[PDB]
Design a protein around this nucleic acid. Structure first.
Length: 403
DNA sequence: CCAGTCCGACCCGCATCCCGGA
DNA sequence: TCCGGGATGCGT
DNA sequence: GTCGGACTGG
């Protein structure tokens, strides 16, 4: 039945309740996700029988609208679902029920991101440092970049320790860090937020992310705090936030699972790059540079702050193009994707980096499995990536720049 | 894209839960 | 019982 | 995390 989901039903189109957002300019924004069923280019009504029996040749379409107050309306392309999932079993879904099951998931995840949890700050600049970072009266601060899971810790009026993630999701386990945080908040400032990283030295990102998301309390990770902020003084410049953070750890520097990262003041770009090369040789991901006057700009709407810089080695390699495919939903349906192979014959999907969507559309509509095997099979695709997968050798965070 | 800001779609890896086929 | 694949929801 | 598109006037 439709009334079991939040939202109204009008003109054969179900519209979830609009989720209110807050833009950077202080203007209200709205986001609505809708579901409609199309058969022979016609919007047919949604009946209860569609949740247990599939109407043949009928397609359910998921689309969304986003508009700022008094602004234009942005309507995404239709996410066409054409078949249910687990079609052979008891837990099988139909085309309509799977569409509402997927639309409600897009709704619940979207409601969590919008508005005492505050999204952590995010880095905008990659391997470049703006000259404005050194034109300030105070030197910028360079830190070690640990390849772990982002986490923010704060205290509630109840007294419990709240420890959430980058997407504002409360970590279930990690009890060993919650204990030290509870003991820590007995001495230090009551209403301060501790922004840091979940990490264990010499451990891969895949192992760190797994233990951070597991309900099992293995209690292995450490909390490396690199920043702090108060909710009422988000405009506090970075250098003052670093000084106050150091005074916090001068109280109790003997915590087992909570540590403060080391700050390095630099005068020019090489002093940063020399420490970057030093940190890489120590086994770290790279280096983070912080503007001295930069305030704490929370990651609302996945915003990236221009007062931070990330210095990381960008690795490249050549891979053997073997097959091709396409995206599944929305604007990616009909857009070509590359498939490369490894010495062990395992495959992976790569996205072309320097193509318009018209090129990827036209490439997929003009290619056949016979035309591909005649012209492009076996070619070399240079691929940028952050790291190689330590278990399967797959280039991770990979994108194809060309041939 | 004039940048800026924001959305939307995707890669792999892992945790978990649901299911059969053994 | 036992083990895999599917599906989902996290993370970089 | 990646990147393209597209609205915004930061």
């Amino acid at each position: 039945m439709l009334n079991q989901f939040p939202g109204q039903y009008s003109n054969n189109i179900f519209c979830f309740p609009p989720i209110e957002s807050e833009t950077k300019s202080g203007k209200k924004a709205s986001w609505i996700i809708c579901v409609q069923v199309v058969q022979h280019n016609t919007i047919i009504p949604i009946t209860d029988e569609m949740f247990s029996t599939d109407v043949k040749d009928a397609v359910a379409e998921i689309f969304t609208k986003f508009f700022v107050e008094e602004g234009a309306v942005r309507i995404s392309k239709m996410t066409r679902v054409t078949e249910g999932k687990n079609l052979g079993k008891k837990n099988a879904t139909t085309v309509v029920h799977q569409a509402f099951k997927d639309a409600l998931s897009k709704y619940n995840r979207h409601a969590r991101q919008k508005r005492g949890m505050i999204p952590p700050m995010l880095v905008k600049y990659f391997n470049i440092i703006p000259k404005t970072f050194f034109e300030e009266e105070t030197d910028p601060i360079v830190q070690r970049k640990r390849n772990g899971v982002r986490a923010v810790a704060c205290q509630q009026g109840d007294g419990c320790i709240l420890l959430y993630s980058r997407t504002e999701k409360e970590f279930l386990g990690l009890d060993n860090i919650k204990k030290e945080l509870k003991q820590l908040y007995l001495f230090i400032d009551v209403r301060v937020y501790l922004d840091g990283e979940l990490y264990l030295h010499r451990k891969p990102l895949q192992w760190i992310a797994g233990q951070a998301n597991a309900k099992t309390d293995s209690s292995e990770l450490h909390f490396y705090v690199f920043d702090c902020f108060w909710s009422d003084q988000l405009q506090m410049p970075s250098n003052k936030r670093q000084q106050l953070l150091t005074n916090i750890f001068k109280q109790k520097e003997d915590l087992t699972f909570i540590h403060q990262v080391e700050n390095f003041s630099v005068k020019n770009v090489d002093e940063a790059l020399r420490l970057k090369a030093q940190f890489i040789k120590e086994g770290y991901e790279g280096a983070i540079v912080r503007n001295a006057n930069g305030p704490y700009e929370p990651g609302y709407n996945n915003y990236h702050s221009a007062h931070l810089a990330k210095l990381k080695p960008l690795l490249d390699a050549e891979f053997i193009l073997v097959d091709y495919t396409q995206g599944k939903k929305g604007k990616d349906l009909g857009a070509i994707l590359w498939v490369c192979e490894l010495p062990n014959k395992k495959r992976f999907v790569v996205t072309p980096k320097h193509l318009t969507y018209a090129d990827r559309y036209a490439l997929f509509q003009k290619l056949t499995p016979a035309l591909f095997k005649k012209h492009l099979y076996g070619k070399e695709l240079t691929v940028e990536y952050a790291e190689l997968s330590p278990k399967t050798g797959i280039p991770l965070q990979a994108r194809a720049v060309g041939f």
